[PDB]
Design a protein around this ligand. Structure first.
Ligand SMILES: Cn1nccc1CN
Length: 188
């Protein structure tokens, strides 16, 4: 077959019911996640190939980067709560991995301030139970799949993308294979 269980994707032995349609996990400490975001634009290219009926979710993980990694999961909850993901993703990746200027929770906050989020608004969100609930949702979704690595993408709590077998000589072809695989899996 063109798409084969075990090749372009794997099938979870323990399927997760009630899972998001398309669920991505990442860490701002994760080098391939940096590539997925600013080099490949995986999420946008996946979105462009799905109908308006399939929704996309993207969650941060705790298991990379120690204390700061956990701070970044809470900051990502702030980004989701305020709807400013598109404003802070590139600066957070650059701050962690390129300039290495993000070393503390205050340095994370600075990225939001520079992106135009008011300080009192960031602080209110950071300390809010709405954000605490989003942190809990991110942790529970990762735990449901016993997640041990990023980047990772899951379709309908049933299928996990397997990019390792794909040709990476051309980046545009790789991204297209990835998105077409997500589309195929979403249609199963
Ligand atoms: C710098 N910082 N971090 C959290 C709260 C404050 C002061 N507004």
């Amino acid at each position: 077959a063109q798409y084969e269980d075990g090749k372009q994707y794997t099938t979870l032995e323990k399927p997760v019911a009630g899972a998001p349609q398309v669920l991505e996990f990442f860490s701002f400490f994760c080098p391939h996640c940096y590539q997925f975001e600013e080099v490949l634009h995986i999420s946008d290219n996946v979105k462009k190939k799905l109908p308006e009926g399939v929704k996309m979710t993207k969650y941060h993980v705790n298991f990379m980067g120690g204390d700061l990694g956990k701070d970044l999961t809470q900051a990502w909850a702030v980004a989701m709560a305020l709807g400013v993901e598109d404003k802070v993703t590139v600066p957070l990746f650059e701050g962690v991995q390129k300039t290495q200027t993000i070393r503390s929770a205050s340095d994370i906050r600075d990225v939001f301030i520079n992106a135009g989020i008011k300080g009192e608004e960031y602080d209110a969100a950071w300390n809010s139970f709405v954000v605490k609930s989003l942190v809990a949702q991110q942790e529970k979704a990762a735990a449901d799949v016993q997640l041990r690595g990023v980047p990772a993408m899951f379709v309908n709590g049933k299928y996990q993308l397997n990019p390792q077998g794909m040709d990476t000589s051309n980046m545009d072809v790789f991204v297209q294979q990835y998105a077409d695989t997500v589309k195929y899996l979403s249609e199963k």
